[PDB]
Design a binder for this molecule. Structure first.
Ligand code: NAG
Lengths: 49, 48
């Protein structure tokens, strides 16, 4: 799974659950392998100039 | 793939299924790759 964003979260993931999805269906959180921690994925700052 | 989903619920109803909602969590995913059309329940006898 490839992507760009800033990686702590307070979302209580269930043991089967690995990643998380927002209303838009874009991934918002992921569970990292090796360490099993849950990292919140927030999109990098963008906007109009 | 054989997907088994499970949920354990404490109930106190005597005879039938309680009326309510409980979402089943996924328990295991098995890569068995076989044809299944029939199934059997396994029980335990009580002997005295
Ligand atoms: C390797 O990953 C598994 C699960 O992906 C984890 O249980 C284990 O602790 C990891 N080992 C190391 C040395 O990171």
């Amino acid at each position: 799974l490839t992507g760009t964003g800033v990686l702590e979260s307070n979302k209580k993931f269930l043991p089967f659950q690995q990643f998380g999805r927002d209303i838009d269906d874009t991934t918002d959180a992921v569970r990292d392998p090796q360490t099993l921690e849950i990292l919140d994925i927030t999109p990098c700052s963008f906007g109009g100039v | 793939y054989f997907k088994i989903y499970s949920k354990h619920t404490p109930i106190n109803l005597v005879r039938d299924l309680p009326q309510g909602f409980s979402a089943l969590e996924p328990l295991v995913d098995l890569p068995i790759g076989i044809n299944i059309t029939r199934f059997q329940t396994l029980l335990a006898l009580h002997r005295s």
